[PDB]
């Protein structure tokens, strides 16, 4: 009847889908077009491109997901993030943003935004004093993602949702790194969330795409006028249904993915080549109790440092014989990669480290293989690196 | 050996492409991937999400179309122009635009630049003085789009080419409507050649996508700028890999296209009916001349002036058998809309007037069908509502 | 370094699997093909349609799977059957097979294969006995499937492969209803595996496909003489794409599906208005020591008889609202029939009777949803008709 | 209204298509699904996988363009012939057969059929007195290709049709080489046509697949007895759509095929190192008028033999820069090839000649490219080869 009443993975297979009306096909169909004919000259004026039906269920599916009201595709994370920024923003307003954001959003707001005159204000979000002290009459907007790079601190998203409110701003949240089946952004206070769904949501790794989910007020705009008039991201239909495919899995992969994590980080912490392990799984993590109110699973995504630096960290991805080297997350695969050595290779030492970076820091997106086999893959590559 | 010395159909078919060397595969693989994995750190380092290879084949093939150094594939006509244009320009610079405009292209200058600080001057590019009389020190660029909707004008390109030069500023001239086989701006002297492929350049109405040709200087930035950092506007690699494919018959297609709007526009221009006809390929066309000297073939696109106004275009549209009713255009079926009745009924009659928007203005897309099939039936539906 | 070492989630994920050697890519690229390019005579020579790259790795991955040595695509369930058999058997040849068998099989077995000279005895197949007594000296294949329909009864795999082979025939077994993660004939002692990759294998409900997988010196024979010279038929490189794309899921969706449909079997086998349930964990099934020794898990398949016959079940399956009505099955999606009221309406009662096919009889191919809301569905349903 | 009172190129265009009912879309949506759902039982009851909107259309367009009832698709080539004649025949039946056929049909023939107890009998079909003296009270069955490789002989259809049905047989015609653009032997009195869409009806290289069109009553015994209960060679929807998509440019791609080749064999037969050119528009060609009244054009294939036998055709396939080497045909792009050296290279050189494979003989198939470049590469390759 209304899926939003089902359970969450009854939701996950069915919301937003139903047999096509006309064929009784089950699967959505795929409506790779860029034309949509009239019947007349009436229905023309009546109906007066930035619309599909195969990408309209995928949106209805994710705005059923995160308990929003509608959703909106687009052809990459960042896509979604600065169509939504940029249908919210002008020249003379603010943003408050966290500083441990992924990589290319940083970007777009430490470069990008000011020279359109939109000025950005960076705080450490895990002090939620600091986003209230940097707040200013021009704040439309406060930004965060949590769990957050490359140390999977955490951001508490209903009192920071509280903060931007009573001050008149918006709460935009990242929500990537979890996906809607392990933690809900608009259930605590935020706004509008935003996704790349080239992570986990498709979870297939053949997919760039983002999705925004939020008030429909909100989405209209950033449809008619993000999309339509600043943009262009419009994701195409195949990828919008090869989405719709992936995320038909997305309930029992985030479990397994936590689950092989939760292992792998016990081990992990266990190791004594291993001097830190970051997870949110894991007692010791430091927000670890807020961890637990936030997110109904830890997560898929494990950060640790192995001893020795910035040679051992080279040496253990050289040695590891299952785990691919990759700077993606999410895939069905697990995937490996030293920042210091790989990403970060020509920043400057202190420079890495201010940004958490330090030299032996290896950050794992863990896949769906057997967790004993992971484990021996990383043990294998440990021994041999130290 | 170098395609880049063989005759333009062979470049359609071939440029950007070759069997896959591990292989010998014909067709460009479709590399639906998101992540690539590396070998080794030492490779990650190298190396360092913004290409594929399949995307990269559709970009190098239509550089050498355009004769430009490099391409850009883009998520849509739209995202190709604010890609170009937002990588270009930023608070407190200038754009001198044609008023005749691409209607998505008008509200991205109208409001959304603005609301960034960019300022945009519109004029009336048939006239090169208003383009000069417009130019301030701080214009970065002169946006030109030729043939122009609604009457298919035209623009000199290469004599704004030299005023925009010699005032210190880039041209940009959107090429959808001609696509390379029917005009080459950048041998004309314009700095970047916009496309929407959604219309001749992937030709089977089933791909919205984008492309920008230019100088590899410019087209990185374009790149590592302007799709990283602002629209997040990638083309996925399957709308690449089919507008390669439609792309294959672009000559082909467009010789059709143009013979047979010609024998419609001659078959017009006989009608007692029609009152106006507007085609690069009349005489009586104002611009004709320049037509002959700037366009290689005067397109597949026809706008014309049934008697009678609103009432008469609208019973026109409703009477026709083979064209079917849309509001895109470079297709294999030939399309057919009455602006007037459909896309701008809510506008008010005075202000359609501005635009060039007669209440009997009918324009229509000439598909492949057989040409005395469509002339009959649009000799059929025009008897019935005249 | 050599998948068939790892752990059976591991090779779902990874094997028949690697990075694209020239670029990198993670996905196996679709090679949408049909012509490939050789750069000399004598590469052509050397060389000398029947294979693609993408194709190879599902075969590879599939003969790892099954433990076999090799694999062929084929471009439906039926084909993998017809293609293995019209490659064994020649005029004057003879099969025995299972009576319970899935429907276009036998249509193949009673009525084509007898056109062509080849002989078929249907037998009871958990009557190994009645296996051994109709063997003749022509027989080349037993034939056999397990579980069954209607009632999912079994077939002992290693006992018939014994009889078959002491008598100098090769077994064949239908392996789709179990997948290769719940049952591995090749292990038992069968010869030949074959799938409709249509269900489980791919899993997504957009696939119809088969797969076999043998010995190398059968498989070339399938391919090279059955595919190439018989029935032609291939399967396209874009569904062997998206069926390795929906096994990578292979493991944790039997697990959802065996999970959810014990929990589902346990309810109805409780519940007043069910006169029985044929479920494989449910310890009254005939054969259920059989099915514990010979399958991992008891599968996502469920038979179960509605109190009142032909009108309550018709009146059952028009009450659900989340299952779907449908004749597949192993999708995502809960998918439920009435035979004697759906397939089998124009069969005459007593004649459906013999097929095992009693009036009352639903057949339910358990989904990925919330365990809960499948039984609330079955239960309101089945609470209105009875 | 009716597409079959169309013109050919707008029935090329449209047949078989139609604005999706529900949504508008203009391109034919891709049903890429295996499940169709029902309403309820009497729903499920009343339809009672072999059917797919997407393919029906590809099906109904192919019907019309070979002025046919009704049409059917497979997976290959190859399958539209064994799912056609494993339809018509059984055990005892007779087929005629011309000799000069395609390589894989023969092995079909030759082999597989006669193991069937299906005994073939060939002919030389350029000679109808060869045929009629081959047929037996059992022959169901006359099969011809044309033109037909290697040397592009031909077959009178309308003759050979006139004498299988004096006979009572039916008249099968493979009619790939053609197109229904060029011929259409069912106007020419055969009953049944096959193609393999691998060719020109696709036209880009990048599907396999095949096509059948008859009567209904004979489509519908292909379809619910040939395809379901033998062959089980369905095409794809994906490979549906693709073919649909290719098949719109078919007019201009067959005039601009056959207009390309008519250059390349004029300048061939000016050329001193060569001996002999095969092509159906070159007044020479044995049966020249035969195809002046059968075919409406002659064709994008050529062969010719070069000066200097085995050698100086290696040499010449290794010296082209331009034409690709490759097997296949009715691509976009100019492919070639050299029997002697590549395909029957380990065929004893008298085997070859009976097969009218000389040493110096070199199948052309003329692409889309320029033709003055395509016969400045040939006349390169010949000139160094000789
Ligand atoms: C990968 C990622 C993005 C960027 O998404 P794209 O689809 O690659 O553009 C943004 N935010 C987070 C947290 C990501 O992991
Ligand atoms: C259609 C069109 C555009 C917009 O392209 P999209 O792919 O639809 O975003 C821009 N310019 C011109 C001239 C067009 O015809
Ligand atoms: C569905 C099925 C088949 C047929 O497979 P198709 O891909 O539909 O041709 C064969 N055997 C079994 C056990 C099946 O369930
Ligand atoms: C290529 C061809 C075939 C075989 O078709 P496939 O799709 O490759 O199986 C059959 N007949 C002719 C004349 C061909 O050229």
Redesign the interface.
Same mark, same amino acid.
């Given at each position: 009847?209304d899926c939003r009443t089902?359970?969450?993975?009854?939701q996950?297979?069915?919301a937003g889908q139903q047999?096509?009306?006309?064929?009784?096909?089950?699967?959505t169909?795929?409506?790779?077009?860029?034309?949509?004919?009239?019947?007349?000259? &009436?229905?023309?004026?009546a109906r007066?491109?930035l619309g599909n039906?195969t990408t309209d269920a995928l949106e209805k599916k994710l705005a059923v997901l995160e308990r929003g009201e509608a959703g909106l595709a687009?052809?990459?994370?960042?896509?979604?993030?600065?169509?939504t920024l940029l249908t919210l923003c002008?020249?003379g307003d603010h943003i408050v943003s966290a500083s441990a954001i992924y990589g290319?959003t940083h970007?777009?707001l430490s470069?990008?935004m000011p020279?359109?005159?939109?000025n950005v204000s960076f705080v450490d979000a895990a002090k939620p004093e600091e986003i209230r002290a940097a707040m200013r009459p021009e704040t439309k907007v406060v930004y965060i993602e949590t769990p957050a790079n490359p140390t999977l601190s955490l951001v508490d998203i209903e009192t920071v949702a509280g903060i931007a409110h009573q001050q008149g701003a918006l709460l935009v949240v990242d929500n990537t790194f979890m996906s809607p089946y392990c933690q809900q952004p608009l259930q605590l206070g935020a706004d509008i969330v935003v996704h790349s769904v080239?992570k986990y949501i498709?979870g297939?790794?053949?997919?760039?795409?983002?999705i925004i989910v939020g008030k429909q007020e909100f989405i209209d705009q950033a449809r008619f006028?993000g999309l339509?008039?600043?943009?262009?991201?419009?994701?195409?239909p195949?990828?919008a249904?090869?989405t719709l495919?992936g995320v038909?899995?997305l309930?029992?992969?985030m &479990?397994?993915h936590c689950e092989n994590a939760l292992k792998i980080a016990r081990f992990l912490e266990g190791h004594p080549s291993i001097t830190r392990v970051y997870y949110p799984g894991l007692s010791s993590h430091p927000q670890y109790e807020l961890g637990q109110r936030q997110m109904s699973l830890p997560g898929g995504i494990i950060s640790f440092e192995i001893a020795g630096g910035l040679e051992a960290?080279?040496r253990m991805?050289?040695s590891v014989?299952?785990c691919?080297?990759?700077?993606?997350l999410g895939?069905?695969?697990t995937?490996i990669?030293?920042p210091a050595?790989?990403?970060h290779?020509?920043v400057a030492p202190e420079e890495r480290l201010k940004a958490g970076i330090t030299d032996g820091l290896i950050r794992l997106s863990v896949?769906? &293989?057997?967790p004993?086999?992971i484990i021996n893959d990383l043990e294998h590559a440990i021994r041999k690196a130290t």
């Open positions: 009847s089902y359970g969450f993975n009854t996950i297979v069915h047999p096509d009306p006309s064929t009784g096909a089950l699967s169909p795929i409506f790779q077009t860029s034309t949509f004919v009239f019947d007349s000259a &009436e229905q023309g004026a007066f491109r039906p687009t052809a990459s994370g960042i896509s979604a993030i600065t169509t002008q020249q290319c970007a777009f470069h990008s020279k359109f005159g939109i080239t498709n297939h790794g053949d997919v760039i795409g983002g006028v339509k008039d600043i943009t262009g991201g419009c994701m195409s195949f990828n249904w090869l495919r038909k899995t309930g029992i992969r &479990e397994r960290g080279r991805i050289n014989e299952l691919l080297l990759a700077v993606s895939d069905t695969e995937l990669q030293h050595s790989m990403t290779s020509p896949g769906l &293989e057997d004993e086999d």
